[PDB]
Design a protein around this ligand. Structure first.
Ligand SMILES: Nc1ncnc2c1ncn2[C@@H]1O[C@H](COP(=O)(O)OP(=O)(O)NP(=O)(O)O)[C@@H](O)[C@H]1O
Ligand SMILES: [Mn+2]
Length: 716
């Protein structure tokens, strides 16, 4: 029958492509081109409306949601015909404005169809519901197929990447970005799982490389993931996995790079948030020997660093995860000594935050107020209690005093530093397991980081990640430019414009260049006299006249605006110097270096310097060099709502993501050329009062400037 092309997907079909019956019925639905449109809306960005009247200047209409609106004609936007309902590749739409895109994804999502292409982009909308589309039957059905030969699916990106690698003898890249809760990690896991399922086996820790690559997740997640408002299993670090292959797709090796762990979370949680999972995994009591080994109770509320917000989360069984974490470490080849050391240090951070301090009666100086929790920290860290507390009270050379606030601050900074270093070391250790003697030719790199971030409060962390997405969006634009070029060249159309990647340089230069934002930040970090306001003066003095992308802040207090590709972002500048330098109590670091616990010693052997900014620049450069040696593939994750509600879509929220993630950006840059291209000659066009500069003739197709087809199918 008409659906025979879908038969191989079995029960997954209703979630991949709607049947031919539904297709032809949708096509007969009542549709007047002139009446059925999109207009702007206050509460819900855009809304499908039916035109009731014209003014001669304005238009009034009947809103979906049952309202009457009066708008300027300029604001009215045409709907795509029923022919285009739930289209699989949105580049094939006649009208490619904001509403057209939003509604095509909304109609797919309403129908439980989670995957859509938009030129190069695979777009994924979080279902918040398990769908039967990740079965062996679906895997079998994607093997060796081209994009156009199967409905949209994350499996298509995976299989094609693997196939491109073998066919073109070339590194591949899968960039999976989006907001917190969008689905980045779910899709990342599917992609890795897919390679492990299909990759060839190469010549002969525990089990197989496939086992080990996958078991890397439960290990990182315990220490790097946490409950946030947005996401029960939020990744609080960016991740880049290169899976290496040999000649015929033999799984050869893998390596993991992690970026910008959230040190703050170690010691602080907002009302509705938790610390990293591991703390609650250990406290679940599932492994009773750990409470005794860590000198700890089962009550998170006994521990100040980890109980400032939430403690439990219904979706997570912390006890089962502890066994998941521990198993992972076993599979990954970690020794008892190595596992116990990380548990000990986790426990030590727990006790560290319970050290209380008081003022000397006749002095403005801090002393310990009880020392039991200090004793437990020192024993676990292989340190001397007295030395530790001496160090914290009287940092040493010349000897400085400390009030309680200073010691409490120093305590928190040290705990964060220890946690961060442990996480890095763990990643380094997993890399040792994943290293093999097997021969490599190519890799496929999978990137899982948060996309572009515009919050109510934007600080240093936001600048860093927004800087990354600028380079990633440029990377996309450049790739898009090369493809559009090959295409105009192949079909024989002389086209001219500057590299699409260049459109992002001015912003990047402002951030990246010598005497740019990062450089000014790092130069100020050299001066002990420098302050937040001296830093803010220095940026302004260098840029407010000179760099168009640097502006006054629009009126939570912000200090300057950056014009990014994704919009104008206001930045708060308080604390950037400290964030960047991360000064520690050197006397206590000296003790860490001399610890009887091998791990602690290791974590501080190589110690200041390198600022957060310069480390970020070093990592981003490495990333970009890898990605540039690569055929890239682009996966855009979208979160549909704030309430975890399956099949429900908030329009302004999806619209915000589309503006920030490249989907609208890609549409915009293709608009510079001739986006609509249809296969068949020149006499018919020359026989119309139509604007003659709006079209060009190619070998296979005729190329149209956007809006010609709009006026062509209209006349039809
Ligand atoms: N394809 C899917 N099917 C079913 N549930 C999903 C899917 N994608 C995401 N989810 C749900 O959404 C949650 C969060 O997705 P996840 O991949 O962790 O988001 P993320 O983009 O990594 N956000 P973050 O890591 O915080 O930046 C998951 O735990 C699932 O419950
Ligand atoms: Mn994640």
């Amino acid at each position: 029958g008409g659906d025979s092309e879908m038969a191989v997907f079995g029960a997954a079909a209703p979630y991949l492509r709607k049947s031919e019956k539904e297709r032809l019925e949708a096509q007969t639905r009542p549709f007047d081109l002139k009446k059925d449109v999109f207009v702007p809306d206050d509460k819900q960005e855009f809304v499908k409306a039916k035109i009731v009247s014209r003014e001669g200047g304005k238009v009034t209409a009947e809103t979906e949601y049952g309202k009457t609106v009066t708008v300027k004609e300029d604001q009215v936007m045409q709907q795509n015909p029923p022919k285009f309902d739930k289209i699989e590749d949105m580049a094939m739409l006649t009208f490619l404005h904001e509403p057209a895109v939003l509604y095509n994804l909304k109609d797919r999502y309403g129908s439980w169809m989670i995957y859509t292409y938009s030129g190069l982009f695979c777009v994924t909308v979080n279902p918040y519901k398990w769908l039967p589309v990740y079965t062996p039957e679906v895997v079998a059905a994607y093997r060796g197929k081209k994009r156009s030969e199967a409905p949209p699916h994350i499996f298509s990106i995976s299989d094609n990447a693997y196939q491109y690698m073998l066919t073109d003898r070339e590194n591949q890249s899968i960039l999976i970005t989006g907001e917190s809760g969008a689905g980045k990690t779910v899709n990342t896991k599917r992609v890795i799982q897919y390679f492990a399922v299909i990759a060839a086996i190469g010549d002969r820790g525990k089990g197989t490389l496939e086992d080990q690559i996958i078991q890397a997740n439960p290990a990182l997640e315990a220490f790097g993931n946490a409950k946030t408002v947005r996401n029960d299993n939020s990744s609080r670090f960016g991740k880049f996995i290169r899976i290496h292959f040999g000649a015929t797709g033999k799984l050869a090796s893998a390596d993991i790079e992690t970026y910008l762990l959230e040190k703050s979370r170690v010691i602080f949680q907002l009302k509705a948030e938790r610390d990293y999972h591991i703390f609650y995994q250990i406290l679940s009591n599932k492994k009773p020997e750990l409470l005794d080994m860590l000198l700890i109770t089962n009550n998170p509320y006994d521990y100040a660093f980890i109980s400032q917000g939430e403690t439990t989360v219904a979706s997570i069984d912390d006890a089962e995860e502890l066994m998941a974490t521990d198993n992972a470490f076993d599979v990954l080849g970690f020794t008892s000594e190595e596992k116990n050391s990380m548990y000990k240090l986790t426990g030590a951070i727990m006790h560290f935050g319970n050290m209380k301090f008081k003022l000397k009666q006749r002095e403005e100086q801090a002393e310990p107020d009880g020392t039991e929790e200090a004793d437990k920290s020192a024993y676990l860290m292989g340190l001397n209690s007295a030395d530790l507390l001496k160090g914290l009270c009287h940092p040493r050379y010349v000897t400085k005093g400390q009030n309680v606030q200073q010691v409490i601050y120093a305590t928190g900074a040290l705990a964060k530093a220890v946690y961060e270093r442990m996480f890095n070391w763990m990643v380094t250790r997993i890399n040792a397991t994943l290293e093999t003697k097997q021969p490599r030719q190519y890799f496929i790199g999978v990137l899982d980081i948060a996309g572009f971030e515009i919050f109510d409060f934007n600080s240093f962390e936001q600048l860093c990640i927004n800087f990354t997405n600028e380079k990633l969006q440029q990377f996309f634009n450049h790739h898009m430019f090369v493809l559009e070029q090959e295409e105009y060249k192949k079909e024989g159309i002389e086209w001219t414009f500057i590299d699409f990647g260049m459109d992002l340089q001015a912003c990047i230069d402002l951030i990246e260049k010598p005497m740019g934002i990062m450089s000014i930040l790092e130069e100020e970090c050299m001066f002990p006299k420098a302050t937040d306001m001296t830093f803010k003066a220095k940026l302004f003095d260098n840029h407010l006249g000179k760099s168009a992308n640097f502006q006054k802040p629009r009126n939570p207090e912000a200090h300057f605006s950056l014009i990014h590709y994704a919009g104008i972002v206001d930045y708060n500048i308080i604390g950037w110097l400290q964030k960047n330098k991360d000064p520690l109590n050197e006397t206590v670091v000296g003790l860490y270096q001399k610890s009887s616990l091998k791990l602690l010693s290791t974590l501080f052997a190589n110690y200041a310097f390198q600022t957060v900014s310069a480390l970020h620049r070093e990592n981003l450069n490495k990333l970009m060099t890898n990605l540039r040696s690569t055929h890239p593939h682009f996966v855009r994750c979208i979160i549909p709502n704030e309430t975890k509600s399956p099949g429900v879509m908030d329009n302004p929220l999806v619209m915000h993501q589309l503006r920030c993630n490249g989907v609208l950006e890609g549409i915009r840059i293709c608009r510079k050329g001739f986006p609509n291209r249809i296969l068949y000659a020149e006499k018919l066009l020359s026989s119309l009062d139509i604007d003659h500069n709006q079209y060009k003739f190619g070998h296979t197709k005729v190329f149209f400037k956007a809006g010609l087809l709009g006026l062509l199918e209209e006349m039809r």
